Amino acid sequence: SMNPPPPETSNPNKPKRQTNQLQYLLRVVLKTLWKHQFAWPFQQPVDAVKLNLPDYYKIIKTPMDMGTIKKRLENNYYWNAQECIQDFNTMFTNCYIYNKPGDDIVLMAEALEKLFLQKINELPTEE
């Protein structure tokens, strides 16, 4: 029971939207990060059971990962690009909360974060 239920990827009440920016977030931004050598720890919810991290969810109360973001984009869960960007941002800050500066996982997150900022600087004007 160490793992909480994963974040929702669809919700019957939450309104859905599609935009060219959200398409870009899936097809370019998420894809670019997903395929990076350092992606793997970020591709699914942290499994505190498999990784033997019994304190992870004692500390992190707003977990977020790229697997969840990918499904959310595929499901048109977000109203706009900012909601999606917020999830990526939570993902990175979580890592910096839980881990010490200079840990390998943190260096990985930092590299992905840099790339993320490069990609969202090219987010297209909404059409």
Ligand SMILES: Cc1nnc2c3ccccc3c(-c3ccc(N4CCOCC4)c(NS(=O)(=O)c4ccccc4Cl)c3)nn12
């Ligand atoms: C995200 C996140 N934030 N903190 C962590 C973290 C902190 C301590 C140990 C692991 C993590 C992980 C993490 C999540 C998944 C994985 N893998 C998923 C695929 O199957 C092999 C394991 C890993 N791999 S891992 O080999 O444990 C590892 C990765 C990076 C740096 C150090 C280590 Cl020891 C690491 N992800 N993570």
